Design a protein around this ligand. Structure first.
Ligand SMILES: [Mg+2]
Ligand SMILES: [Mg+2]
Ligand SMILES: [Mg+2]
Ligand SMILES: [Mg+2]
Ligand SMILES: [Mg+2]
Ligand SMILES: [Mg+2]
Ligand SMILES: [Mg+2]
Ligand SMILES: [Mg+2]
Ligand SMILES: [Mg+2]
Ligand SMILES: [Mg+2]
Ligand SMILES: [Mg+2]
Ligand SMILES: [Mg+2]
Ligand SMILES: [Mg+2]
Ligand SMILES: [Mg+2]
Ligand SMILES: [Mg+2]
Ligand SMILES: [Mg+2]
Ligand SMILES: [Mg+2]
Ligand SMILES: [Mg+2]
Ligand SMILES: [Mg+2]
Ligand SMILES: [Mg+2]
Ligand SMILES: [Mg+2]
Ligand SMILES: [Mg+2]
Ligand SMILES: [Mg+2]
Ligand SMILES: [Mg+2]
Ligand SMILES: [Mg+2]
Ligand SMILES: [Mg+2]
Ligand SMILES: [Mg+2]
Ligand SMILES: [Mg+2]
Ligand SMILES: [Mg+2]
Ligand SMILES: [Mg+2]
Ligand SMILES: [Mg+2]
Ligand SMILES: [Mg+2]
Ligand SMILES: [Mg+2]
Ligand SMILES: [Mg+2]
Ligand SMILES: [Mg+2]
Ligand SMILES: [Mg+2]
Ligand SMILES: [Mg+2]
Ligand SMILES: [Mg+2]
Ligand SMILES: [Mg+2]
Ligand SMILES: [Mg+2]
Ligand SMILES: [Mg+2]
Ligand SMILES: [Mg+2]
Ligand SMILES: [Mg+2]
Ligand SMILES: [Mg+2]
Ligand SMILES: [Mg+2]
Ligand SMILES: [Mg+2]
Ligand SMILES: [Mg+2]
Ligand SMILES: [Mg+2]
Ligand SMILES: [Mg+2]
Ligand SMILES: [Mg+2]
Ligand SMILES: [Mg+2]
Ligand SMILES: [Mg+2]
Ligand SMILES: [Mg+2]
Ligand SMILES: [Mg+2]
Ligand SMILES: [Mg+2]
Ligand SMILES: [Mg+2]
Ligand SMILES: [Mg+2]
Ligand SMILES: [Mg+2]
Ligand SMILES: [Mg+2]
Ligand SMILES: [Mg+2]
Ligand SMILES: [Mg+2]
Ligand SMILES: [Mg+2]
Ligand SMILES: [Mg+2]
Ligand SMILES: [Mg+2]
Ligand SMILES: [Mg+2]
Ligand SMILES: [Mg+2]
Ligand SMILES: [Mg+2]
Ligand SMILES: [Mg+2]
Ligand SMILES: [Mg+2]
Ligand SMILES: [Mg+2]
Ligand SMILES: [Mg+2]
Ligand SMILES: [Mg+2]
Ligand SMILES: [Mg+2]
Ligand SMILES: [Mg+2]
Ligand SMILES: [Mg+2]
Ligand SMILES: [Mg+2]
Ligand SMILES: [Mg+2]
Ligand SMILES: [Mg+2]
Ligand SMILES: [Mg+2]
Ligand SMILES: [Mg+2]
Ligand SMILES: [Mg+2]
Ligand SMILES: [Mg+2]
Ligand SMILES: [Mg+2]
Ligand SMILES: [Mg+2]
Ligand SMILES: [Mg+2]
Lengths: 51, 63, 76, 96
RNA sequence: AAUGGGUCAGCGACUUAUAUUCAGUGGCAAGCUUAACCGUAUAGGGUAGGCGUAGCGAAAGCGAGUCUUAAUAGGGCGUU
RNA sequence: AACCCACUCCCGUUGAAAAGGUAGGGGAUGACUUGUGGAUCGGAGUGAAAGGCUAAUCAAGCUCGGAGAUAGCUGGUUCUC
RNA sequence: UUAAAAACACAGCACUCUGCAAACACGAAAGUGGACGUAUAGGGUGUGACGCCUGCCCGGUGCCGGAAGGUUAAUUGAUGG
RNA sequence: UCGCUGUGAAGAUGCAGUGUAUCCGCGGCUAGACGGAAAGACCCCGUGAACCUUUACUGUAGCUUUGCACUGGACUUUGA
RNA sequence: CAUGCUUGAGGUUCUAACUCUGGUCCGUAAUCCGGAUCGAGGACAGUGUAUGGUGGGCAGUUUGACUGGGGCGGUCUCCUCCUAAAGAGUAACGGAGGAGUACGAAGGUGCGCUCAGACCGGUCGGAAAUCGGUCGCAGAGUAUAAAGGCAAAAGCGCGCUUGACUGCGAGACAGACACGUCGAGCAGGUACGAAAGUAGGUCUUAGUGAUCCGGUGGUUCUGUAUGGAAGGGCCAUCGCU
C-alpha cells in the first residue's frame, strides 16, 4: 500500500510535512519546495522517516 | 459531608467568567489523513454547549 | 435476505427560494453536479455548492443555449 | 455524568493544561482599595494590618480599578502602567 | 372468568445530618459574614478563614484588557 | 418362626400415622442382627456410589454476626378545594 | 420418605508405582496412619466366576528414556550514551 | 346467586333481546362457578444465584530447577 | 614456557558443621524428650529467602444485542438508487449494488483538440489493426458502485511547475451532544500567463475509530531551599478488522 513518510525542511528549522507514498512504484526520494513558516520562505523539503 | 468533585471533569473543564473552557477531540493521532483546515479549526478552546452545562456542573459539584 | 443496507441522507436541495433576501456567504443550493448554474453574483464550491458573494435577492432564470437554469443575485 | 452507556463528556474530551504552583502566593489589589490602609504607606505588612490580602501572600500587584483617594507610598509592590499613572497623579510617590 | 382483600378495632411507608443550587422574604452594603474557642454564657468578644469588588492565558505574565499570530490585521473571551 | 428388611395389591391422603395398616413377599450361622461406651463434620466428614447421609433441613447443615448486603424487578403509599 | 434394577460390590485378571525414614494420606509443624507390615508386601487404576479368545495403528495427547545441538530466570555488569 | 341466542379484555348468574319460574329444606351425583390448594417447576427475560467441566481468563496449594545463607579442609582436572 | 597471586567448572577424598523414625548409659519407676558416647551418612541431604517449569488439586469470574417466542442461520460502521406520498426527513430479518482505496502525476497553470459508430477505396489482417474521404452529434470518455453532472468541456495532449501553501476567516448548511460541510475576503511568501487572471488537491457524493496510555521533533512555559537537571505543560506527529 502507501506508507507514511515525512518531509524535513532543508533550512535549520525542525518544521516538517507529512504525506504518503508508494515505495514500490517510486523508490527514489522526493525533492519539493514548500513554505516554511519559521523562516517564511519556500525552501527545499526532503523525504525522511515517520518512525 | 463535603461534596466531592469528579477528578476527571476538573482536568477537562476550566471555570472562566464566560463559561467553561475545554479542548477539542479528534486531534490526538491519525493526523496525516486530515485536512490542514480541519486541524487548524480544532486547535483552540471552546465554551460548553447550552444543553451540556447542567450535566457538567453537576459532575463538578457546581450545582 | 442479503439486502438490508442503505446510506444516510444528505439534505440536498434549494435552501433559499426566489425573492428571498440574501447575505454574502449564504448557501443557496446543495447539489450533486450542476442542476443549477452560478449566475451573476454567485460562486461555486468544489462540491458544486452555490453560495452568495453579494447581497440582494434570488432570481432563478432559464436562459442562454443548452437550456440551463441559473441562480443570480440582483439588487432589491 | 451518566448518559445511558454512551461515552460521557468527562471522558470524551482531552485533558489540558497544568496548575501553577507559583500563583498560590499571589494577590491583586484595586486602586480603589488603596485608601484603606492606616497611614500613607502601602506595604505587604500594611495590607495585612487591614484585611485586603490573606496572611500567606508574598507578592502583590496593583491594577487600575476605581479612583485613588489620597497620596500613598508603595513599598515593594508592583503596579500596572495605568495604575501607576493614577497613583502619581494624586501626589503619591513610588519607591522601593 | 387478570391481581388483592372474610370482617372489625389498633399499628403501618418521602425522614434526619452535613455540603450545596434556585425562588420567596429580611439585615447590612463596596463590602458582607464569622469557625473553633473565651464568656456575665441565646448577649458580648473572636474577622484566622470564605464570598464579592477584573479579566485573559496551559503557564511565565500582562492588565480594561488579554490570548492566538511575523501582524497594532482579523477572530475568541472580558470591560461603562 | 423370632429378628432384620421392604417386592405387590388395596385402604388411608383434613390419615390412628409429617411415610402407616391388613393380606401376601425376601434373608434368616452370616459380607448377619442388636445393646452400651467411644472416634471422624461443613468446601469438611462418611459413602458395597443413589449426589446418598451428617437431629422430620443437604449440588455444601444449624446458629449468631458483616446486615437495614444487593434487587434497572413485582406489591403498597393515608385529608380538602 | 414415588426408582431394588440390567445399577454398586464381588472372587478371578491385568497395568503401573513403592527398597522402608517406602509410595500414598491427614496435619502451617511436631507427629500419626500405611505397619510394630517389608516386593508371594503395600497404594492407585481398569475389567468383573468359568470356557474359547482378546486382531491392526506410536501420526495427536500423556508417560518413560536420551543428551549432542538450539532457545531459556533470578544473578553478573563489559561497552556505549 | 335461572335457560337460550348474541355482544363484550375475544368461552357471561349479573350486559342486550327473549323464554321460563310460588317460598324453604333433606337424601344423592359432580356438568359449571375458567372450583380449593402451591406469587408455574415447562418457555422467555434479569449486564440474577448456585454447583459442575475444560487445551476460556487470571491466579494459587502441592511437586520440581537454579543463586545466596546455614557451609569446612586437601588433592587433581580445567577456563579467565 | 616455569612458577607466583587470585578466581569459573568438574571429579575424588577427609572430618569438624549438619542429619539419623541405629546401639548403650544417665535424668528415670518412662519405646516421649534431652545430655554423654559408639556407629553411619556428610558438606550432600534438609530449611529460609530469590527465581524458571508444572499445576481444574483448589478460587474468583467472563461467555453481546437484534430477532413476528428463544435457539440455528444472518446482521451490526460508511456510500448510491427505490420504498419515500413533486421542499427536508421518514420504518421493516423490505427490493438492488458498492467501500475499509488510488495518484509527485491521475495535482496547479498556459496553450491546443474533439468521441463511439457506420459506409466507400486501399498490400499480407479481412468482421474488426494502420490509412484517405463522407456522415455522425456524444449512442464515447470520466481511476474505482450508482445517482446527479460535464463545451469556459469536468473528456484528450504538450511545455513550465508544487496552491496537495502558513496564519486566519465575514457569512451560512446541517445538527441531542461529540463530530461534519461550503466558503468570499485580509496578511505572508509562491507557480503558470503578455495580461485580465487562475491555484487553500483530484466532476461530486464511500476509502473510516473518541478518550486514556506510551514513543519521536521543536519550545522567550514550569521545574518542590537555590543554580541546573529529571518530570510536567504547549505545538507538530506516530501506535487500535
Ligand atoms: Mg483533584
Ligand atoms: Mg484524528
Ligand atoms: Mg499532541
Ligand atoms: Mg433491504
Ligand atoms: Mg432511509
Ligand atoms: Mg435516501
Ligand atoms: Mg475554488
Ligand atoms: Mg485576612
Ligand atoms: Mg363472577
Ligand atoms: Mg390467574
Ligand atoms: Mg401477572
Ligand atoms: Mg390490587
Ligand atoms: Mg383472594
Ligand atoms: Mg438582599
Ligand atoms: Mg480583541
Ligand atoms: Mg466581546
Ligand atoms: Mg427391635
Ligand atoms: Mg389381598
Ligand atoms: Mg407384612
Ligand atoms: Mg416371613
Ligand atoms: Mg436363597
Ligand atoms: Mg456391637
Ligand atoms: Mg467432633
Ligand atoms: Mg458449607
Ligand atoms: Mg446422576
Ligand atoms: Mg436442629
Ligand atoms: Mg434428615
Ligand atoms: Mg456492609
Ligand atoms: Mg432486606
Ligand atoms: Mg403482579
Ligand atoms: Mg431386590
Ligand atoms: Mg420401593
Ligand atoms: Mg447402586
Ligand atoms: Mg500391584
Ligand atoms: Mg464394569
Ligand atoms: Mg460385561
Ligand atoms: Mg513415538
Ligand atoms: Mg506418542
Ligand atoms: Mg528425557
Ligand atoms: Mg333459581
Ligand atoms: Mg364474539
Ligand atoms: Mg356466551
Ligand atoms: Mg349487575
Ligand atoms: Mg342480562
Ligand atoms: Mg346497558
Ligand atoms: Mg345437598
Ligand atoms: Mg360424589
Ligand atoms: Mg361440581
Ligand atoms: Mg384453579
Ligand atoms: Mg414473590
Ligand atoms: Mg410467578
Ligand atoms: Mg430448565
Ligand atoms: Mg452482557
Ligand atoms: Mg441489560
Ligand atoms: Mg512414620
Ligand atoms: Mg536417645
Ligand atoms: Mg562419626
Ligand atoms: Mg546441601
Ligand atoms: Mg538445596
Ligand atoms: Mg526453598
Ligand atoms: Mg534453595
Ligand atoms: Mg473445575
Ligand atoms: Mg472453576
Ligand atoms: Mg486455568
Ligand atoms: Mg476447582
Ligand atoms: Mg464478587
Ligand atoms: Mg457468573
Ligand atoms: Mg466480558
Ligand atoms: Mg436476546
Ligand atoms: Mg424467531
Ligand atoms: Mg408469531
Ligand atoms: Mg446467533
Ligand atoms: Mg422528498
Ligand atoms: Mg411530500
Ligand atoms: Mg420510526
Ligand atoms: Mg457490505
Ligand atoms: Mg481527471
Ligand atoms: Mg452517470
Ligand atoms: Mg467551447
Ligand atoms: Mg437549519
Ligand atoms: Mg510573471
Ligand atoms: Mg497577479
Ligand atoms: Mg484504558
Ligand atoms: Mg530547584
Ligand atoms: Mg522540559
Amino acid at each position: 500500500m502507501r506508507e507514511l513518510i515525512r518531509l524535513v525542511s532543508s533550512a535549520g528549522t525542525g518544521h516538517f510535512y507529512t504525506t504518503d507514498k508508494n515505495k514500490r512504484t517510486k523508490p527514489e526520494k522526493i525533492e519539493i519546495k514548500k513554505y516554511d513558516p519559521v523562516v517564511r520562505q519556500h525552501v527545499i523539503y526532503k523525504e525522511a522517516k515517520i518512525k | 459531608p463535603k461534596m466531592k468533585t469528579k477528578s476527571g471533569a476538573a482536568k477537562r473543564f476550566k471555570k472562566t467568567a464566560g463559561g467553561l473552557k475545554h479542548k477539542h477531540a479528534f486531534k490526538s493521532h491519525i493526523l496525516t489523513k486530515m485536512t490542514t483546515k480541519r486541524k487548524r479549526q480544532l486547535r483552540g478552546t471552546s465554551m460548553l454547549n447550552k444543553s451540556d452545562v447542567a450535566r457538567v456542573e453537576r459532575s463538578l459539584r457546581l450545582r | 435476505t442479503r439486502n438490508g443496507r442503505d446510506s444516510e441522507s444528505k439534505r440536498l436541495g434549494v435552501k433559499l427560494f426566489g425573492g428571498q433576501a440574501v447575505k454574502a456567504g449564504n448557501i443557496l443550493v446543495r447539489q450533486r453536479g450542476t442542476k443549477f448554474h452560478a449566475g451573476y453574483g454567485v460562486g461555486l464550491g468544489k462540491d458544486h455548492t452555490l453560495f452568495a458573494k453579494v447581497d440582494g435577492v434570488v432570481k432563478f432564470e432559464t436562459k442562454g443555449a443548452f437550456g440551463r437554469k441559473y441562480v443570480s443575485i440582483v439588487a432589491a | 455524568g451518566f448518559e445511558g452507556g454512551q461515552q460521557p463528556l468527562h471522558r470524551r474530551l482531552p485533558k489540558f493544561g497544568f496548575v501553577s504552583l507559583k500563583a498560590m502566593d499571589r494577590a491583586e489589589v484595586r486602586t480603589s482599595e488603596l485608601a484603606k490602609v492606616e497611614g500613607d504607606v502601602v506595604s505587604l505588612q500594611t495590607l495585612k494590618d487591614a484585611n485586603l490580602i490573606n496572611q500567606h501572600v508574598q507578592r502583590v500587584k496593583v491594577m487600575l480599578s476605581g479612583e485613588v483617594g489620597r497620596a500613598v507610598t508603595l513599598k515593594g509592590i508592583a503596579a500596572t502602567k495605568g495604575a501607576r499613572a493614577a497613583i502619581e497623579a494624586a501626589g503619591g510617590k513610588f519607591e522601593d
